[PDB]
Design a binder for this molecule. Sequence first.
Ligand code: ATP
Ligand code: ATP
Ligand code: CLR
Ligand code: CLR
Ligand code: CLR
Ligand code: CLR
Ligand code: FY5
Lengths: 575, 575
Amino acid sequence: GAVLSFHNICYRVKLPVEKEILSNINGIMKPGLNAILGPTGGGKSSLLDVLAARKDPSGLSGDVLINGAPRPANFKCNSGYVVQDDVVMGTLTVRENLQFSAALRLATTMTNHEKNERINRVIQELGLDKVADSKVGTQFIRGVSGGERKRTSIGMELITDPSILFLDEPTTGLDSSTANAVLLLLKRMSKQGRTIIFSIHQPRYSIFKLFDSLTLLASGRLMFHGPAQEALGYFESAGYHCEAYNNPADFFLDIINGDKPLIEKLAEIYVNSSFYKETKAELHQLSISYTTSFCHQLRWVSKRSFKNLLGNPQASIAQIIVTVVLGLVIGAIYFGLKNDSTGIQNRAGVLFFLTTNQCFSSVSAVELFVVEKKLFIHEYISGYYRVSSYFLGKLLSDLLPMRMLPSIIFTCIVYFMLGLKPKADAFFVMMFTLMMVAYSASSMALAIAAGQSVVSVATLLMTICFVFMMIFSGLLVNLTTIASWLSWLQYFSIPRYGFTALQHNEFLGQNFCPGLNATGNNPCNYATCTGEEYLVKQGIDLSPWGLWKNHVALACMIVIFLTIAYLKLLFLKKY
Amino acid sequence: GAVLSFHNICYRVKLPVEKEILSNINGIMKPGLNAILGPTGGGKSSLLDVLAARKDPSGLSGDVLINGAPRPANFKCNSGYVVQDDVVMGTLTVRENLQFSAALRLATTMTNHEKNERINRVIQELGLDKVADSKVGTQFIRGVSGGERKRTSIGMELITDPSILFLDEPTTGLDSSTANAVLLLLKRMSKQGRTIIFSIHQPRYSIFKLFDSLTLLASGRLMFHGPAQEALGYFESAGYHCEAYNNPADFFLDIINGDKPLIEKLAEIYVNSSFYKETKAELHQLSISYTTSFCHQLRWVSKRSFKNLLGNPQASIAQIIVTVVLGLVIGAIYFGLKNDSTGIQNRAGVLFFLTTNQCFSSVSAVELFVVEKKLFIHEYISGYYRVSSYFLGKLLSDLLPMRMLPSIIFTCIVYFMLGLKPKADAFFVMMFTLMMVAYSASSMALAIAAGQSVVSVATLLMTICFVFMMIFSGLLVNLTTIASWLSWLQYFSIPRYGFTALQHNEFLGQNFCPGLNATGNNPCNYATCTGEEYLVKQGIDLSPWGLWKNHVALACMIVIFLTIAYLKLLFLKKY
Ligand SMILES: Nc1ncnc2c1ncn2[C@@H]1O[C@H](COP(=O)(O)OP(=O)(O)OP(=O)(O)O)[C@@H](O)[C@H]1O
Ligand SMILES: Nc1ncnc2c1ncn2[C@@H]1O[C@H](COP(=O)(O)OP(=O)(O)OP(=O)(O)O)[C@@H](O)[C@H]1O
Ligand SMILES: CC(C)CCC[C@@H](C)[C@H]1CC[C@H]2[C@@H]3CC=C4C[C@@H](O)CC[C@]4(C)[C@H]3CC[C@]12C
Ligand SMILES: CC(C)CCC[C@@H](C)[C@H]1CC[C@H]2[C@@H]3CC=C4C[C@@H](O)CC[C@]4(C)[C@H]3CC[C@]12C
Ligand SMILES: CC(C)CCC[C@@H](C)[C@H]1CC[C@H]2[C@@H]3CC=C4C[C@@H](O)CC[C@]4(C)[C@H]3CC[C@]12C
Ligand SMILES: CC(C)CCC[C@@H](C)[C@H]1CC[C@H]2[C@@H]3CC=C4C[C@@H](O)CC[C@]4(C)[C@H]3CC[C@]12C
Ligand SMILES: C[C@]12CC[C@H]3c4ccc(OS(=O)(=O)O)cc4CC[C@@H]3[C@@H]1CCC2=O
């Protein structure tokens, strides 16, 4: 089968400040059951990642040679990597997660019936039949414990039918007789050609027999590499005796920890050993395309995020409910506005609140998008889909429906309850304008929080930007008294465009005076008797170009921010 | 030493829907080294909690008898409980955490020098000298690994000099030769009278010798209880043989898992065993005050939260910085307001924004308070302090300084930059009013989010309430057109009181007309020529009672909400 091999592996990590993890490991793997066993945080996951082509190639001083020839281009297609920290999506069922992996990472012509057959096979083999359709962990719903979740994580890669396999701590938290079941499964599979590579913590001596090739790492340096049955012989020759300890693994790990630095002494002793010579001799003897179409990747990512949204209420149902309640409350407060000395303040207040609420709502959904960062990274480097597919899928999942909906709710209730402009064109223009401001706010939210780690800083920055934009809306300050050298910032406010468009189609045919015919017989200034005078004092144009110009400014903002978000994703250091 | 004993322990957990965890355990502990070893999620933490008096006594059908006499009142004073999930505060150093525990849970007359001596002793013994003053984990700052963190958690109770000790999975993630160090320490201590009780996952056969009394739990039922050296004899008699397996613990746990339900068969076999008779025979043979003063508990909790705030920037430094920047920006935008046709809109906008920003800021700090819920619960049931002490400590830590500060910043910048009322009394009234609204918003935040689990729902509810309150502020809707049967809600708005008080001392001596002397020669209505006419149209009283009444309404809201928060804490199911 696959014969991975490496030569002079080294690595460095930037703390301008740099360190070395993994100092100079020289070794060969083989088809069968290979292993990496060493002290925690000594270089176990690091080496596994480096072998899996999952770290930035600005540190692997050295190489990797599959069967001699360099890493084939489909290497990430032909191998599975079981992560160490359970990147399984919490709001789905187990069977749906496995369906997801099977649908994306397998062939196309395979009938769905056979995919389900394989899924049931994995479900039985991993010991998951009871929780097969249960719900994985969530903050609201307590879910299956680590055992079932980790077995889910392992199944997600086991379903891929890989010809190479990688695992990082496959049994951490698995119960003693379920870890044994897992490893007996692995050993049974590792007799058909699959080259298994994994780390492990304190295996049982029964497990220890199953191994073929063993590798000890402690503080980067390679300590031993050879068959597990001769690990004992090596240490026995180098002045140690087995019989005192009964589980070889503990004898090995105690030797490392002292049961003039020792680690270097062990390293320089190994480099003097015959195994090293055999390693060097054979080593010198020896010397992206995705599976399924774009439409399919789009379909399946969109469906998964549909399921996630329906499963998560605090961003989907909570928003709709608070929107309905606010619509009703506002319909009650300002009910039946009067064309009177109060109508101007009332109308400006209503329009400003609708606009600013449409703006500030978008933060919740972008938080739900941000928390997917690590999951997305792991799914990408594992070769699921293209970046563009993930992007458009998330768009059609959340940004399209959950933001198009509240605007319809708000207009359909408020508009006729509050007695705004009574024609139809004004109704639909209000509806469309609210849609536009919602989408633009979402786009800015994405472009700010596309590629960020922590959700609290993203939220803080987003709220700061939105506050700065709404300060320029036009209600809080009369825009014609802002100084000359600061007015230019008025063009950068989404609420400005939205609120301006809303006022322009509302105030246009209005007059707020006791009797319009003979209220001008005493034509005092500072009167605002007609609506248009109020519109002018706020600095707004009157020909339809004012309204449509606001709309096109909003559309341009949408497109620009979406492209910026896509670029921040594409160039992100996806490692 | 202490001889805990129990009889007919049972428990139930409400899923109106109920289950049984821990079915009918009957057993004795003794001074020395006792243990609980059984399959994961089979009843190991549950029993330990029940013995530790840490579950609601609506399920312990049965009893616990220390040396025969019932549980003494200082039982939570004389025992330490090492939790399973690392409730150590992430933003402190290790030595400061241990100082905290030593200062609260030990005597008073002990000189601080000796407390530090004990701390160094524990630091050496637990293997923590290197990270003794490092920083525990944080999102912003990567921190010491679980090994060091778990040793910190264990030290926090080991410093108490307890005459009884409890541990739940003391070694999960500890390195093989550090787990061995921990357990050799425990065994060495368990020869001086301390009655150690702990669970464990897959101990080594070397460790297995150290035990004195063993206890196997699998699906609630008691499987075996007797010395670890005769556990083998029991199973050997009941048709099993040891030699096939080399680590007794794995032989035991494999027997449970099948290496006609078996679990009940084992239970009914045990109840027929001689050990059961000895247990029954001896069992039938056998048959809160805090340490330090209030001032001291207050001092130390306040100091710890001081350290936490300084260590956390996103709620302490970020707020001050954004406040300064907003102060400068607002000072620039409205610079030098004019008593002119725009002054009314400008002034109302500035005052409304200041008020609503003071209101909406309080959410961050209350989030930081909410995330302390589980930590507070664990520290209370462990007998650190009184509830009132924790409450007043958190108040003097966060609510006092971090909310008193921004108001001073805002007034000192904005007030003179924007040319508001130019006397001093108005300056200080604005300052005091902003302080009051800040405190009232914080109080409502606490009373809403005192005793809540998830931070996202608390934030959502809080923002909904704040939005509903500001809708009634007076800028967005003219309060005299709200219907009769909804006006009463105007008294429930903090922004209403704050904004009203701010407008009342500002608009009072003002007139917004071209030339005041002969602008009334054309006395048209809908003019708002003087400020007071604007004040009246908004429905505000003019005698000083308007201003002071707003202040007293705010003070009453503060007191009411603080008492409500304290009651929600006190009656909380602190188990
Ligand atoms: N990205 C990183 N940043 C900072 N330090 C790192 C980074 N990667 C490794 N290190 C450091 O290198 C040392 C070894 O890390 P390593 O990844 O090999 O532990 P590990 O293999 O994952 O052990 P385990 O699998 O049990 O968790 C660690 O002490 C760690 O501090
Ligand atoms: N408060 C509870 N609510 C619901 N179920 C519970 C509760 N306490 C226990 N259980 C149930 O009882 C079973 C056993 O729980 P238990 O506490 O004994 O696991 P455990 O001892 O803590 O195992 P481990 O220590 O490794 O975590 C679990 O399956 C759990 O679902
Ligand atoms: C019902 C209306 C009037 C309440 C106002 C909206 C807020 C307060 C309500 C509306 C719907 C509610 C949510 C409905 C469903 C769930 C799922 C549950 O497992 C946890 C609570 C949670 C997340 C609720 C939290 C509170 C919530 C968001
Ligand atoms: C990176 C982000 C913030 C880029 C900001 C670009 C925005 C502000 C740009 C994109 C298109 C631009 C608009 C293009 C056309 C018009 C119509 C014109 O008669 C007035 C200016 C106006 C309305 C522009 C204002 C600025 C504008 C809206
Ligand atoms: C638009 C303007 C005002 C944005 C203001 C952002 C400033 C005030 C905020 C944004 C993100 C914040 C940073 C977030 C994380 C860290 C890392 C930590 O180890 C030190 C504090 C530090 C560096 C914070 C300091 C305050 C900070 C820089
Ligand atoms: C739990 C929450 C909603 C408590 C609500 C309490 C509020 C509404 C209470 C607390 C203090 C009260 C105020 C105390 C004093 C005055 C001054 C008086 O000349 C008019 C009534 C007025 C203004 C009261 C109105 C009601 C009031 C504001
Ligand atoms: C209340 C409001 C939503 C949120 C408000 C807000 C929220 C945070 C804030 O500052 S912040 O520190 O929380 O970042 C300031 C403001 C000022 C006005 C703004 C709106 C007026 C109408 C509206 O619906």
